[model samples]
Target: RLICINDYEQHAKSVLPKSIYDYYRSGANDEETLADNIAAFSRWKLYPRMLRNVAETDLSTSVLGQRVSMPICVGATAMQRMAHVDGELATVRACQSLGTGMMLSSWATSSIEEVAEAGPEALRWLQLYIYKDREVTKKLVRQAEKMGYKAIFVTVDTPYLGNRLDDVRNRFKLPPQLRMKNFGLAAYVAKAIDPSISWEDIKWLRTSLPIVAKGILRGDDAREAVKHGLNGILVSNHGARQLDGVPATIDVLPEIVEAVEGKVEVFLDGGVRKGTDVLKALALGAKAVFVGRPIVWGLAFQGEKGVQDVLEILKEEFRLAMALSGCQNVKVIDKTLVR
Candidate 1:
C-alpha cells in the first residue's frame, strides 16, 4: 500500500519512463535549494502541548475566503499528463473529493475547459507564467475567469526557466500520445517566457481575477505586491525548481507573513510532504500549504485513486498531528505551536 509521499515517489520511479521521472525530480544546478526544501522542514521541531481537549480535532480552514476541509491544497503542477493518462482530470476529481482547492497550471496538459468540465464546483484556482505575448496572457486569464476559476496565481519567478541539468542530459520530450493542450506543445513554454518581467509589468494584469503574487520570497516584495492590489502571496521558491540557492519556502515564510501583517492571505509551496509539514506551515502563519510533486507521484502511481489516497493520508495525518499537539481547530495553530 502507498503509505507516504516517498512511497508514491518510489512507485512513480518504477512505473514512469526515465526522462519523465527525471523531469519530475530534477532541480537547477547542484540542487541545493531542492534538497533544502525538504530538509528545512526537519529543522523545525514541534512542541506538543498537554491539557487541552484532544477528543475532537478540527482540521478545517479557509483560504482566500474559501472553506477547505483541511489546511492543505494542491498547488499548480505542470504537465501532469506525463504522470498518468487521466492527468489533471484525475487530480481535480481527487481534490473535489477531499473538499480542498487545486491550482491548475497554465501549462496543464488538460485545458481549463476540461478541468471545469471534470469538476464544475471544485475550489479551483488558475496559475500562470507571464508569457512574451501580453495579449495571449490576457486571453488565457479571461478564459480562466469565464470558467469560474476562483483566483489567478501568477508565477512571478520563472520569467526564465532555470538550467535544469536533468532535462538537458535526458533531453526531455513529451510523449507523442500527449500534448500540452494549452500551448499545443510543451516546448512552446520555453519560447514564450519573458525573462525581463518586472513589478511594473504586473500593473496591467489580464483581469481582476484575484491575482496571487506567487514566488514572492521577500517580505518587502510581498508588501509591495499587496500595495498593487494583489489578493494573496505564496511564499515559494518555485518548489526549489527555479533557483539553486534560494532559502526553502518555510525558511522565508515568517518574514513575508510579518511584512504583509494580515493585509492579505499568505500561502506557501515547497517541501510539504507530511501532515507535520502542513502543521509546521500553518504555525508559521500560512493560511495553507500547497503540495506539488507528491500529488504528481500519487497521480503517476494510481490515477485518481492514488491522488485521493495521498490527499486523505495527509488529511488524516494532519488531524492526528493536531490531536497530538492539542490543536482542536486550525485557528489554534499559531507560531507558538512550534519550537
Candidate 2:
C-alpha cells in the first residue's frame, strides 16, 4: 500500500520492534521539547501576498555555493540499516535524484567509502561526533576528506547519549548479525561516548573540511561559530533527544539568526514535519531546513521508494508555500511572508 511518510510513522510504530520505534520517536525526559518543537511552528502564521505573478516559481537555492532543488536538506541520524537493509545507500540515492544533499552520520550502518562510491557525484556531507581520542576524530575527518565529503557537520548536542527509557526498558540490542558495518563492532562499542569535543575542535575540523557546527542554541555560541571561522551553524536540539528542556529549534532559530548576522550559513532541524515549517524557517533566515525522523519513517515503510516519496511530498508542499506566499524564487522568501 502506498502511504505518505507522515502516515508511515503510525505504520512504523505498529511494525517496528518497540525498542527501535521508541529510540527514533521518543524524546528526552518528559518529551516537552519534542511536543513544543512541533507545536511552536503552529504559533507563527504565514501572511501571504496574493495576485503576485505566480505563473512560475523557482524553489531552487544554494548552500555553501552548491545549488539545490530546494532549501531543504536531509539531516543525518544513525543506524539506518536498522530501519531497512538499504539504509544510507537508499537515502543517498533519494537525495541525489531529488537534487539535494544529505549529511551522512559518522555512525552510519554503511562505510563512508561505500556511501561515497554509491553516490560519487552527489553532494555528501560527513556528520561527526567528537571522540575522547583526538586521533580517532582526526582520522575520521581525514577519511571524509579523502573520500570527497564536501562538508563536515560536528554534532554538539549529544555530549553523552540521552537516557532513552524505552531502550533501557526493552534492553534493546541489535542482532549480532546486524551491526554498524562502518565502525565495526569493537570501534562502535568503544566510542559511544564522545566527550572531548570543544570549541577548539571546531578549528581543527575547519582545517580539514568546511566545518558546520551543529547543535548551537545560544546566541553566544552562534556568535562564536562565526568568530572561529566555521562555515555554517545548524540550530538543533538533537531532535529533542538529548536535553529535554532546551527551547524548540524554531523558538531559538530567530535569536541565533540575529546573532550570526549573515556571518555564516545557518540551518535549522527538529520537528520540521510540514512544508509550512520549511517556509517558516526560510522566512526567519535559515539557509536551509532539515528533516530527520520523517526520512527514517519513509525508509521503514518502503525503503528507497519510500524515502523518495517523502522528499517529493515536501518539495510539492514547499512549492505551494512559495506560490501562496508570493515568493517567485527561493531567494525572495523572507520575514514578510510570515505573520
Candidate 3:
C-alpha cells in the first residue's frame, strides 16, 4: 500500500477530514492547470543511452553553494499544522536527515524561530510574501536571516488569492488551536498579502543572502528579474493554486531558463510525482525540482518518517533513471536526454 508517494495521497485522503483534504488538494476554478501539471510530464519521454557504466550513480547537487543529497527539494506550503501535529517541524527534520533543502512559508503555523530550533542544521529558505505593513515584512525577513536561513524566496505570485471554490464551499478556516505563528494570528492573506509589490522591492530587500524570484512563468519576467539583480528564478505557477489557465510549470521551464541565460540558477515546482519527472525537469534545464503535495502527503500519512520515506524513494528512483539513461551525474543531465 505504501510502495510509492501516490499511495500516501490515498492514505491521506482517508485519514484527513473532508475540508482539510480538499484544502490541500483542490485547485482554482475549473482546475485545467492542476490536471495538466501532471499530464504534461507524460508528453516527454527519456531517450535512454546504451552501453554505459552503471555501477555508480550520484544525485548530489548544490543550490546557491549549498550541497544537497538530491536535486529534489521541498517547496513552501502554508499552515502545516492542519496536516499533522508535528507540522513543519516534522518536515524540517526529514529534510535535515535526507540532506535536502526546505522552504518555510511566511504563513507557516510554526514560527521561524521554532523551525530553526527544530532543525538547526537543516538547509532552509524563507518564502517571503509582501505584507501591507512594510515593517511586518521587514521583521519577518530579518528574523529568517537571523535564524541562518540560506536564501529568501520572494513569492511574486498571489497578488490576490485564486478562486478556490473548495475553500468557499467548505468555509475553510484555520482551526482555533493553530495559528499563523509567523504573523501571531489566524488572519487571512486578504488582509495582509500586499498586491502593490514590485521589482524595486526586490532591490530594496537585497542583503548578503541570495534573493530568488519565485512564481515566474514568462521569459520576459525572468529577464526582468535578472535586470533587477535577483539571484534565481523559480519557474512556478503557485502549484496551480493561483491560476487555472496557465501552462504547466515544466512546460514553461525551457522558456524561462533560456531567458535567464545561465546568469542564475533556475528551479521548478508542480506536478513532479516521479523520478523521471525530476529527470525531465533537469534535462530541460531546471537546476532542481521542488515537490509540494508529495511532501504534504508524506506528512499527513506518517509525520517525519513518511516524509523521509518519500524523499528516499525519489532518490532511489532518480538513481535508477541516471543509470539507465547513461548520465553519470546531475551535471550530465542535459537537453539531449529528453525528447
Candidate 4:
C-alpha cells in the first residue's frame, strides 16, 4: 500500500544497514546544500492557468532524440546492489516496462551487458568516470557502445571524494558479496578516478553518440560545455554529495538554461521528491529531471515491483499536476507556469 516516495524511503531505512543508508543519505560537510535542494522548490509557486480544455494530459517528451513517457528518468546512483538483491537489474526492468530512461552508474554493482539484457527495450545511457589508467575508461565506453546505450554522461565534478563524514565514521565500503561489475572482481572507485581530467579531454572522448557533461553548477561552465559541442548539460552538485555549500541545483538551473540559450538541452538532478517538483523543473526550462535516492528507496522496498511503484506514483501525480495547472502536455509547462 505504498502511496508516496517518503514511504519507500522509510521502508528502505528500516531494511538497510546503517552504513549503507548513510552512504546514500548523507551529503558533504554540513549538508546545507542537500537541504536546500528540497527547500528551494518552495520559493517558486505554480501559476496555474484556468479554463483550458484539459480533459487529457500528456507527460511524454523526448530527450536527446529519444521519446520517453515522462520527463522523470532514473538518475545515476552507484552500487544499487547495496539496496536490493536484484539491484540495477530490477531498476532497469522497471524502466523498460514504464517506457522511461535510465542512466546507469559507472559504479553500479551490475555490469553493462547485464542491465542491457534486463531491459533491451529501455532507453539507456551510461555514466562514466575518467580513470587514471585511460584504457579502463575506454573499455567501459566501448562496452556500453557495443551494448546499445544511447548516450554517455561524463561526470566532471569529483576530482576526489567529498568529505562525507558518514563514510569516515562508518568506514563505509562495498559489501563483501557484491562488486563494481563494470571494472571486474574487486577494487574501489576511489583509487581509479583520474583527477587530472580537463576540458581538452572532451575531444578525446569524441564519438558519434551524444555526450552530456554532468555536474555543471554554473552558467559559465554550462556555456563552456555548449562551446565544446556537448549535447546536454546536467545541473548537479553530485546530489549534494561532492560539495556542501553550493547552491541548490534548481536555484542555479535558470542561469544555466539562459547560458545555454537553446544550444543544448539542460537537465537537472537532486532532491526531486514530488511530481510537482518535476513540473517545476520542466517549467523552469529543464528538458527533464532525474530522481536518485527515491529509486534506491524503491529498490530496497520491493525490488522491481517497488521501483515501478515509485515511478507510477510520480507519473500519476505529475499527470494530476498537469491537469490542475492547465498544462495539457509537457510543452505547455513554460516559465509563465511558475513565478
| Cα lDDT, model 4, residue 157 | 95
Q: Order of all candidates by lDDT, from best down to worst? A: 4, 3, 1, 2
> How well does model 2 score by local distance difference test?
0.84
Please report the TM-score between candidate 1 and the true structure.
Answer: 0.97
Cα lDDT for residue 208, candidate 2 = 47
Clashing pairs in 1: none
lDDT of 3 by residue, 239-308 (tens): 8989889999989999999998999999999999888999999999999999998888998988999899
Error of 3 at 258 (Å): 0.5
| Regions more than 4 Å wrong, model 2 | 1-4, 184-191
lDDT (10s digit) by residue, model 2, range 205-271: 6654688888999999989889998888999998988888889998899999999888889999999
Clashing pairs in 3: none
Answer with 2 or 4, whichever has the higher TM-score.
4
Off by over 4 Å in 4: 184-190
- Model 1 off-target regions past 4 Å? 184-190
Give the per-residue lDDT digits (tens) of candidate 4, residues 1-339. 579898888888899999999999989998999999999988889999988889989899999999999999999999999999999999999999999999999999999999999999999999998888889899899989999999999999987888888888888888999888997111244678877889988778876789999999999989889888899999999889998899999899999999999999999999898999999999999999999999999999989989999999999999989989999999989899888
Q: What C-alpha lDDT values do all the predictions have?
A: 0.89, 0.84, 0.90, 0.92
After TM-score superposition, what is the CA distance of residue 108 in candidate 2 from its true location, in Å?
0.6
